[PDB]
Structure 1
């Protein structure tokens, strides 16, 4: 646990290592014909000191739960990440030359198909949030000794998501977290705004509650000392570096971001760098203290059936909070995150019952999703984050990168559609189905009553990928019995007869408007089938088609969402070309406005009267 103060030979070996990492970054990107060797070279001493002096990890088991974590937030330096894992003996050195090949897993940016990568980066400014999740988990959940190290670029620090993470780390006293800032003066197409004004970087980090140390980022000695000192808060190592360090004629120059060296130049430069290496002997990694606890990864089962009665009224947003609190007794892995909306999403119910597993993320949806991604790495927790579904659009890039990260997180967005009423469109989620459907690993739950909500929470907990649960503000009736069985991809027909003339597909509030339309239409001797998709993605194509063939081929979809990318388009895409099938679509056609929930459902054509009129038109 004591700092090992390195001797001159260890320091020279660390320099030798840094220069090997430079050579490999050049060799790999020259072989590929693309990549970012100058972004690797500014970080070479940082990487050498982190992996071969400061960090503790099992070199043959990069995912080991006891290891220190490293997050390469500036992911385009991936070639030097691969180089250090070859230097540590995990990767074959020859494989480095296959960078970016379709036959290789050493892809252009890091991805979790690599055993040594937890989260995909590549979209700048997201790695520190993931690192915050890992550090929060290490400190408060695992209660383990591992530390978390996150390397960022300086242009990258213009992303506001970084400063959300900075503030989070100081609020939650993440003394096990270190950010290393590669202040190499340059971004992609110009100098970074602050260039080498190291004092301003320090003042910004200190103002956000971090211990901030300015170092020469090419001094292995200064780096060892800065990483070695006792930590009492999150620590920012602010490293003055030169982009392309060590590449004569390219160091500190513009016009070289993302440009590989041509073969003739790479050969000449590599010879120069090799001439500075004093010994070929490599440093060994040092293994960690193994105090991370075992975690139970068994299937998660609610401790009891939902306790609703048909006819009771409850909003699905409230049912979500009740279900999540119940799920917290079913598994110790469940954690909840929310962005200062816990009294609106009803995640406050989980906080009341399991306060040690609730993370207040404040008004910072970007960071919230990244925290959850970090908490889910190495399967340590099962995260449920919540806010208004509208404000998950604030975090779409984090959610997009979460799927590239093959992350298992759960996201519950409330207040969907116009049915929230008087707040108006800024709070109305009308594009969240389009957004989450376009996330390739996503399962999209749209529970229509309290029972379906509790079952969706339970299914989501056991479902891999990006799970989204769309909850609602109006208090609708329970329609399902408590022992109704639900499955991903299985819809429910909630009203049917042999004389049905249309299959009406609704969800949430429009499912209940469809049921109300059915009772109205029965007064005119018109029966309609009513179908509740349960999951919008994957869609129950078979039950939808079987239903439509029983109702003269006619489908009517009605949704509290815009036309594009929602339920209607999902259904149309599933059934197009099937003989005799037709699809009519009722949705919200423009930015809405303030009014009572029922008034807005009417104004935008998705209430019981609009459904009934649409049905009448189809018959005639």
Structure 2
């Protein structure tokens, strides 16, 4: 029920907006860096959202019943900090420690701050995360909390934003409000549309949003705009001036990310303070408590894998099966896929648990941001899937997911040349490089159905950015159903006493190495075959012990480019160990179409390459 504010409450919201301006200035001048002009356009929005519109516990920002706020334009972090001091949560003196190594008031928001769920310094990402939170609130939590996301106008140039706009209308997120700070300017020039407010409205409405144009420096218009619920996602299109309230700087270029020098900070602050009618702060209003409790326990498969050694299944299929199976053990599991469900086999999970499958369409960036938003406050355990090749489309979302300390799971299918005829646009050959460079990642590369099921289970229970690399060829099951698997533990899958070299393969190259072993025993050459299971962390101890047993010789073979994959991880793990050598076989250039087996041979990673190389 909207509380229509009185003059006094209005004046108090303007005072708050002006305190927020002063604090953004003081903090950024104290730091000697930061973005006070990007704070100042948003001052009334922030005052009205925090001190009229939103409902939350000011002493418990993470509380699951709270309305959510996402500062998509993350460089306005000082004003986010200022509202949490205004609300009583942060000590006001701490605001001056902005950007110090002794402070958690960092340059852009990050989840070490209790009041931040997702990191947003890379622009255009916050609305997708907000859609994750709103989808969760409407469809999973089924709670009364709302979700507010504040975007810049330059920021609306990112296509990820429009993926999120489209998602919100497809999924009728009428508990989501995007506020667009139309302050006319980006970093280095005006934003393309400047103050053509009608064209912003037309773009938003075309994408299915209820779009209201407001004076973004009118606390009353903002109250009223935020005050009416809709049956659609709502876009509050706020006409503002960058550096609003800073005389001489308002509506000027050349001021993005430039702090006021001390002397100018003092003079400006004094003018702003002269506008403030009372020192007295507005109190936050707490939320209706209707979010459900969510069970934190380990999630276990309801049975062991039911594959038999010798049956043939592609690991992309085993993943679909395993994920559906795991869906029956826990209600927190959700799946997301970008119009590839029939190829990744996440369609299996959709069939069994339709209410927990989210079709994300051809929009990999948004898919990862939705998963990040679903995983905030630990509300769900998301598994996203597409071809591994197209996770490169989402690399900045993935990179920011680690800075957001996010626990999301990603399964990318169709890795390497062994997909065959589609050709290199669909071949993931850089995904091990990409995910290894993500600092909280665990990289699972299961070589058969059993290993795949076990990887799914382990990933579910593993913090950080979990990636699972699946494959298209239907290889044999080689592991017993009851084989134990752990993160960082490899498997020796063929061995003797008289082994000439330890061959390390994974997925299709593991089975190529076992086939090479068969060619090689014909000439009385034994090879140890090792399946790493995780590429990160790598089982160094096992790899070294195997190498010492095989006259120091390691051969790595991978359906991936040479850089940042299995061969380099292994090289980096063993370099400088006496008596250890490492030969690396990998894919040396952009591939082409052909049969899976023909490509494996053309690119020097099939049984014959492996066999030919061991002899050397």
* Superposition TM-score tier, normalisation by shorter sequence: over 0.9
CA distance in 1, matches of 2:98, 2:497: 62
1:608 shift after superposition: 0.1
CA distance in 2, matches of 1:486, 1:611: 26
| Post-superposition CA distance 1:274-323 (Å, at most 9, x none) | 00000000000000000000011100000000000000000000000000
1:407-418 mapped onto 2 (5 Å cutoff): 407-418=406-417
CA distance in 2, matches of 1:307, 1:456: 15
SS in 2 for 1:484: coil
SS in 2 for 1:375: helix
Residue in 2 aligned with 1:163? 162
CA distance in 1, matches of 2:27, 2:294: 39
Residue in 2 aligned with 1:504? 503
**Number of aligned residue pairs:** 616
Residue in 2 aligned with 1:88? 87
RMSD: 0.2
1:231 shift after superposition: 1.5
2:338–2:367 CA contact under 8 A, matched in 1: yes
| Post-superposition CA distance 1:489-529 (Å, at most 9, x none) | 00000001000000000000000000000011000000000
Hey, which bits of structure 1, 4+ residues long, moved more than 3 A?
none
Unaligned runs of 5+ in 2: none
CA distance in 1, matches of 2:464, 2:58: 28
Residue in 2 aligned with 1:359? 358
CA distance in 1, matches of 2:531, 2:57: 50
1:224 shift after superposition: 0.1
| Post-superposition CA distance 1:175-228 (Å, at most 9, x none) | 000000000000000000000000000000000000000000000000000000
CA distance in 2, matches of 1:585, 1:331: 41
Q: Structure 1 residue 31 and structure 2 residue 30: aligned?
A: yes
| Post-superposition CA distance 1:416-462 (Å, at most 9, x none) | 00000000000000000000000000000000000000000000000
CA distance in 1, matches of 2:588, 2:35: 45
| Post-superposition CA distance 1:10-50 (Å, at most 9, x none) | 00000000000000000000000000000000000000000
CA distance in 2, matches of 1:83, 1:190: 27
SS in 2 for 1:330: coil
SS in 1 for 2:217: coil
CA distance in 1, matches of 2:613, 2:443: 27
Residue in 2 aligned with 1:124? 123
CA distance in 1, matches of 2:386, 2:277: 56
CA distance in 1, matches of 2:505, 2:424: 21
CA distance in 2, matches of 1:462, 1:425: 33
Residue in 1 aligned with 2:462? 463
2:148–2:177 CA contact under 8 A, matched in 1: yes
CA distance in 1, matches of 2:222, 2:367: 31
| Post-superposition CA distance 1:94-146 (Å, at most 9, x none) | 00000000000000000000000000000000000000000000000000000
| Post-superposition CA distance 1:522-581 (Å, at most 9, x none) | 000000000000000000000000000000000000000000000000000000000000
CA distance in 2, matches of 1:110, 1:548: 46
CA distance in 2, matches of 1:216, 1:489: 56
1:235-274 mapped onto 2 (5 Å cutoff): 235-274=234-273
SS in 1 for 2:328: helix
CA distance in 2, matches of 1:492, 1:131: 41
SS in 2 for 1:131: helix
CA distance in 1, matches of 2:162, 2:464: 27
CA distance in 2, matches of 1:238, 1:108: 26
CA distance in 2, matches of 1:479, 1:296: 35
1:232 shift after superposition: 1.0
Residue in 1 aligned with 2:419? 420
CA distance in 2, matches of 1:230, 1:544: 60
Q: Structure 1 residue 66 and structure 2 residue 65: aligned?
A: yes
1:230 shift after superposition: 2.3
SS in 2 for 1:188: coil
| Post-superposition CA distance 1:235-291 (Å, at most 9, x none) | 000000000000000000000000000000000000000000000000000000000
CA distance in 1, matches of 2:330, 2:37: 47
What TM-score comes out, normalization by structure 2 length?
1.00
CA distance in 2, matches of 1:298, 1:360: 27
CA distance in 2, matches of 1:541, 1:256: 51
CA distance in 1, matches of 2:579, 2:183: 64
Unaligned runs of 5+ in 1: none
2:174–2:229 CA contact under 8 A, matched in 1: no
Residue in 1 aligned with 2:208? 209
CA distance in 1, matches of 2:604, 2:289: 60
2:98–2:105 CA contact under 8 A, matched in 1: yes
